[PDB]
Amino acid sequence: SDKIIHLTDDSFDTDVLKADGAILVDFWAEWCGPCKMIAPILDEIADEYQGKLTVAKLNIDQNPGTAPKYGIRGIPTLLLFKNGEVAATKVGALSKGQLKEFLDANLA
Secondary structure (H helix, E strand, O other): OOOEEOOOHHHHHHHHHOOOOEEEEEEEOOOOHHHHHHHHHHHHHHHHOEOOEEEEEEEOOOOOOHHHHOOOOOOOEEEEEEOOEEEEEEEOOOOHHHHHHHHHHHHO
């Protein structure tokens, strides 16, 4: 895909909690049409912000355990982990512009 980490509950700790940078964890599901629809945007963003931001796409169907942990009651969820610190959590799709702005504002 791109600079998109297909995380698992098991890898979550080492990858996200110990993120050597900023990791945007997108919580998605096989049935999540909208998640797929934003995937190109996430890919583009992941490329654009390479070195500043890293992106991940965690499948809750495969990893149910991770959903409760971050109160994933709706997807696509976008949780921005700055070195494991959840800086911001967005729920639902948004425009590339909004996403870029959000990311810029959080990264600062």
